[PDB]
Amino acid sequence: GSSGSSGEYGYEDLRESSNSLLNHQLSEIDQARLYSCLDHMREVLGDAVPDDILTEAILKHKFDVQKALSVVLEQDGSGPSSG
Numbered sequence: 001g002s003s004g005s006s007g008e009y010g011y012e013d014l015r016e017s018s019n020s021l022l023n024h025q026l027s028e029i030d031q032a033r034l035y036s037c038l039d040h041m042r043e044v045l046g047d048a049v050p051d052d053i054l055t056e057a058i059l060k061h062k063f064d065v066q067k068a069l070s071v072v073l074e075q076d077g078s079g080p081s082s083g
Contacts, residue, residue, distance in 0.1 A: 034058060037065045045072055 005014060017023060026034060034055065038046070041054045049072075057068035057075075 030063070033063050037063060037068070040065055041069060041072060044069065 005011065025031075037058050038051055038054050041049075041057070042051070045054060054068070054072065057072045058065070060071065061067040
């Protein structure tokens with residue numbers, strides 16, 4: 001957390017995501033949130049929609065189902081319009 005990776009230069013050195021797996025694993029905290037969120041949006045879109053889609057949406061608003069949904073909804077609703 002504290003004193004880790006910051007600044008432009010730093011990133012450069014790092015060169016691409018140092019570790020993917022780790023990142024993926026995500027911090028237990030976030031994870032609990034992601035899952036606690038995904039699950040939700042899951043029972044909604046998850047029905048047919050996969051996880052990634054939802055997962056992204058979440059990361060699309062740094063964990064914000066309320067938004068991820070409002071967006072995940074307008075995303076599909078976009079198709080059917082006008083008449």
